[PDB]
């Protein structure tokens, strides 16, 4: 689960090319890739 004001950043950019929004885009990318990094092995752990 991702929170509010968390995918709305990942859809479009309400600003025009700001660095803090690059940091704010690389944070949500990680908060959405990390859970995948766990659930891709979780259904291997189910076999254990």
């Amino acid at each position: 689960a991702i929170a509010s004001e968390a995918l709305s950043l990942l859809s479009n950019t309400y600003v025009d090319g700001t660095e803090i929004d690059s940091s704010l885009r690389i944070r949500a990318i990680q908060q959405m890739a990390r859970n995948l990094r766990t659930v891709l092995d979780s259904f291997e752990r189910g076999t254990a």
């Binding site: 660095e19 690059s22 940091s23 690389i26």
Partner: peptide, 22 residues
């Protein structure tokens, strides 16, 4: 502390006389 190696993203050994136990 450094901030520089993170702001880019977004020798010798002497012997001792000791008492070794495992």
């Amino acid at each position: 502390r450094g901030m520089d190696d993170v702001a880019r993203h977004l020798p010798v050994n002497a012997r001792v006389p000791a008492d070794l136990v495992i």
